[PDB]
Design a protein around this ligand. Structure first.
Ligand SMILES: N[C@@H](Cc1ccccc1)C(=O)O
Length: 290
C-alpha cells in the first residue's frame, strides 16, 4: 500500500499519502479540488504507479484529515506555499510533475506561476485561471438545464434556501450532469464531498455548492499571468464539464506549448468517468517529458 503520514508542514500538520512506483520514473504531486474537498476523489490516479509514476496525495489546509489553520490563511497563495513546503519537505530539490483538479487546477496554475522552476510538467484537469469566467460559464449551464431544475436553482438560490428539497433535486441533477455522469458515484468521490461539507474551508473559500461560488475566491483571476508558464502543460476538460472547455481554452490559449484534450462524454470528474483513458493520457504526458 501507499505510505501515509501526518507530518507538520509549513506550520500546520498536513495529511499526505505517497504511493511509490515499483520502478519509479517520475514523481507526480496532486492537488484536490474544492476548496475544501480532499485527496480521496483523486485516488483513481493511483493506477499510474503501474506506469512507473509515483503519486503524492495530500489534504490541503482545513481539508480531509489535515488541520485547519488561521482563517487569514484560507487563500490560494497560502495553498501554494503549503504545496511547495510539502514538495521540498518530502522530495527536497527534486523537480516533480504537478496535477490539479477543479480548484486544485487553479491552485496548480498559481503554484506553477511562482514555482514552475520546481516542475517538470503541469497537468490541469477541469481547472480555471478565473473564477468569474467559471461562474459566467456555469450560469449558462444552469440556463441550459431543463427549466424544471433551472427555475429551482434560480428561485431558492436567491433566497439562500439551499436546504429546500426542490433546490436539492436540481443540484443533484446538475451534478449528475456536469460533476460526475454516472449512477453509482464512487466512495472516494462521496468521501471528498462529505469532507468538504464537514470542514470549514469549503464554506469560507468556495460557497454553498459547486456552482454557487460566493466565497473568498469569487473574484480570483490570474489569466493575465499564467502566460509565464513555460513548462510542458497538459490541460484536460470534459465535454459536459461544470468548468466548461471554454474555461480550459483560456488557460490553453495563454500557456504556450500547452495541450488541450477534451474528454468526450465526460464531465468534471473525468478521472472516474474515463479512469483508463484519463490515466493513460496523464501518464503518457509525464513520460514524454521526463
Ligand atoms: N467545488 C467544485 C467546483 C468548483 C471548484 C472551484 C471553484 C468553483 C467551483 C469542485 O471543486 O469540484
Amino acid at each position: 500500500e501507499c505510505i501515509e503520514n501526518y507530518a507538520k508542514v509549513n506550520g500546520i500538520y498536513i495529511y499526505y499519502k505517497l504511493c511509490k512506483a515499483p520502478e519509479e520514473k517520475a514523481k507526480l504531486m496532486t492537488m484536490h479540488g474544492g476548496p475544501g474537498m480532499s485527496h480521496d476523489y483523486l485516488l483513481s490516479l493511483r493506477d499510474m504507479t503501474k506506469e512507473g509514476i509515483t503519486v503524492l496525495f495530500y489534504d490541503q489546509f482545513g481539508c480531509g484529515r489535515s488541520e485547519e489553520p488561521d482563517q487569514s490563511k484560507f487563500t490560494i497563495d497560502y495553498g501554494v506555499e503549503e504545496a511547495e513546503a510539502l514538495r521540498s519537505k518530502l522530495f527536497g530539490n527534486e523537480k516533480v510533475f504537478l496535477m490539479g483538479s477543479s480548484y486544485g487546477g487553479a491552485l496548480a496554475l498559481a503554484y506553477a506561476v511562482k514555482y514552475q522552476d520546481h516542475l517538470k510538467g503541469l497537468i490541469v484537469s477541469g481547472g480555471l485561471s478565473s473564477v468569474p469566467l467559471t461562474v459566467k460559464e456555469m450560469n449558462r449551464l444552469i440556463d441550459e438545464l431543463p427549466a424544471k431544475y433551472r427555475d429551482a436553482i434560480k428561485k431558492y438560490g436567491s433566497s439562500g434556501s439551499y436546504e429546500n428539497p426542490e433546490y436539492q433535486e436540481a443540484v443533484n441533477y446538475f451534478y449528475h450532469q456536469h460533476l460526475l455522469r454516472s449512477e453509482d458515484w464512487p466512495p472516494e468521490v462521496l468521501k471528498s464531498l462529505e469532507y468538504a461539507e464537514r470542514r470549514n474551508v469549503y464554506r469560507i473559500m468556495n460557497g454553498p455548492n459547486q456552482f454557487t461560488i460566493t466565497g473568498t475566491i469569487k473574484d480570483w483571476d490570474i489569466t493575465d499571468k499564467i502566460s509565464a508558464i513555460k513548462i510542458p502543460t497538459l490541460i484536460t476538460v470534459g465535454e459536459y464539464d461544470e468548468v466548461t472547455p471554454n474555461v480550459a481554452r483560456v488557460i490553453h490559449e495563454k500557456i504556450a506549448g500547452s495541450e488541450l484534450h477534451v474528454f468526450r462524454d465526460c464531465s468534471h470528474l473525468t478521472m472516474w468517468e474515463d479512469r483508463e483513458g484519463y490515466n493513460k493520457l496523464l501518464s503518457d504526458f509525464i513520460l514524454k517529458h521526463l
